Design a protein around this motif. Structure first.
Motif, PDB file in Angstrom:
ATOM      1  N   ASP A   1       1.032  -1.121   0.040  1.00  0.00           N
ATOM      2  CA  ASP A   1      -0.112  -0.124   0.127  1.00  0.00           C
ATOM      3  C   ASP A   1       0.732   1.246  -0.038  1.00  0.00           C
TER       4      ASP A   1
ATOM      5  N   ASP B   1       2.092   1.638  -3.369  1.00  0.00           N
ATOM      6  CA  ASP B   1       1.037   2.247  -4.485  1.00  0.00           C
ATOM      7  C   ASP B   1       0.853   3.809  -3.933  1.00  0.00           C
ATOM      8  N   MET B   2       0.599   3.900  -2.904  1.00  0.00           N
ATOM      9  CA  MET B   2       0.430   5.651  -2.592  1.00  0.00           C
ATOM     10  C   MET B   2       1.789   6.359  -3.012  1.00  0.00           C
TER      11      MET B   2
ATOM     12  N   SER C   1       3.527   5.835  -5.373  1.00  0.00           N
ATOM     13  CA  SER C   1       3.460   5.830  -6.909  1.00  0.00           C
ATOM     14  C   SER C   1       2.347   6.905  -7.303  1.00  0.00           C
ATOM     15  N   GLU C   2       1.189   6.941  -6.526  1.00  0.00           N
ATOM     16  CA  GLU C   2      -0.011   7.749  -7.038  1.00  0.00           C
ATOM     17  C   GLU C   2       0.424   9.270  -6.767  1.00  0.00           C
TER      18      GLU C   2
ATOM     19  N   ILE D   1       1.343  12.575  -8.954  1.00  0.00           N
ATOM     20  CA  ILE D   1       0.532  13.615  -9.615  1.00  0.00           C
ATOM     21  C   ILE D   1       0.318  15.037  -8.599  1.00  0.00           C
TER      22      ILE D   1
END
Lengths: 52, 158, 148, 149, 52
Positions: B38, B41-42, B44-45, B48
């Motif tokens: 998790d 993934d966070m 990576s997100e 933006i």
């Protein structure tokens, strides 16, 4: 921004464009024309040949 | 001192008292692996909205490990931990508290303050330059630059 | 690495309180099939309002499988999973907590931020161009084209 | 992957958990045909307010069957299912939850966005076309023609 | 169709051209000369050094 002129030959106008390529050091020209055709009534023309 | 990936999940679990160092009960390694996933993934997100902050992504087909370093400085630990903790509360069927929310908001504001950049508006490019700048007809300095003109060539109909 | 189908379903199930190691419960195949079908339908409709995120659909009449590859970038996983969880929650007669809704909204906004348009409308077409750029030699147009 | 009329009814039942694959208690077959009739009539009325979306109607003297091809694209499945579920919840004496309402509203808005059409206003027809249009080459150049047909 | 000029230096003329191939704020300039050399008779020149 390309040098151009217009020529005439039996009532037909042709546009000539002159330009060149920078790095290769080559000059070139081109002539163009855009035609269009219609067919009003096909019953007013055809092909004729000598009959026996 | 390097900040490992596995230290973040332990910090979050200690912070919300799910599992700590001095706990008679501890969670299984599968939950820790899921937490590391998790976090990956966070991060990576976050490319933006919050922007890049120097996180070290796993390179290639290798999976993340809790013992691998993350490259994040110490000053970002609290913010990242609070964000992850808020993002992984529903896993254990729990709910946040107002104090934790205020702490998370303050840490997020501190994180966003450091990376803030305010852009400036450049001139148009058809703006005259005054006679006081002593421009020259020799150069195109009579006007501000940044126009990108004269892309003519072949490929007609333009 | 590579993001596959079903793993998003497993993520959503684990994120809520169904079929997780924390609860000691086990995943049930009916949940997997329902989640995969719901994902397919949700992406099919997402083709409309959000522009596109590069999802891969089944070709032909072949049924989707949990071992297939979705093809999405890993930076859309949380958004897709949270939306899919919000769409599944009604199946088990459960209601979401405000924090889950906030997380889903934040993920959706992060997804939307990466898909802007800003069309930047152009001139009309009968708008005259100035005489300062010498439309006789430097450019051919005497008025803006206005369309492509 | 064609979409059948009976699949939408099954989806509507599963979404609110009236009956599912692992239900241990299924509905009688009469309820399925009732749902199919409700879907058909809902589309009949949807022919008025929203635009036609390619639904297949049982033209003739026959009746719909749950195995008949709907003709709808897969993108409309959630919208149609949620609308039908909201229509037929009261059959079982129940009450929708706010999350279901929000999901149905979102899907319906997506469908409306997909089917949106915006008309453009033409000129009256007594408007004088400008002198700079060389209005003596074709007809309807001295004045605008207006709407056709 | 390329902007140019002629520059003189000790009686030598140099042709200069400016063009903008590429679309990344990239401009280009070039200066050129073509020389011609002839040798009439090799027996009227050469090298000379000192001698001991």
């Amino acid at each position: 921004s390309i040098d151009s002129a217009v020529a005439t030959y039996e009532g037909f106008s042709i546009r000539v464009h002159k330009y060149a390529d920078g790095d290769a050091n080559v000059q070139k020209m081109r002539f163009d024309l855009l035609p269009a055709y219609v067919c009003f009534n096909p019953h007013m023309g055809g092909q004729f040949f000598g009959n026996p | 001192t390097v900040l490992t990936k596995g230290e973040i999940v332990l910090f979050a679990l200690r912070k919300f008292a799910i599992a700590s160092n001095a706990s008679l009960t501890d969670v299984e390694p599968q939950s820790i692996e899921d937490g590391v996933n998790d976090l990956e993934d966070m991060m990576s997100e976050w490319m933006i909205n919050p922007g890049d902050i120097g996180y070290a992504f796993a390179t290639g087909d290798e999976q993340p490990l809790p013992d691998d370093e993350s490259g994040l400085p110490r000053k970002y630990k609290h913010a990242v931990g609070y964000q992850l903790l808020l993002r992984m509360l529903s896993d254990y069927s729990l709910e946040p508290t107002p104090q934790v929310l205020s702490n998370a908001q303050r840490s997020y504001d501190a994180l966003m303050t450091d990376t803030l950049v305010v852009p400036s508006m450049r001139r148009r490019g058809d703006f005259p330059v005054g006679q006081g700048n002593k421009y020259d007809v020799f150069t195109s300095d009579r006007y501000y630059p940044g126009d990108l003109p004269l892309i003519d060539g072949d490929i007609p109909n333009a």
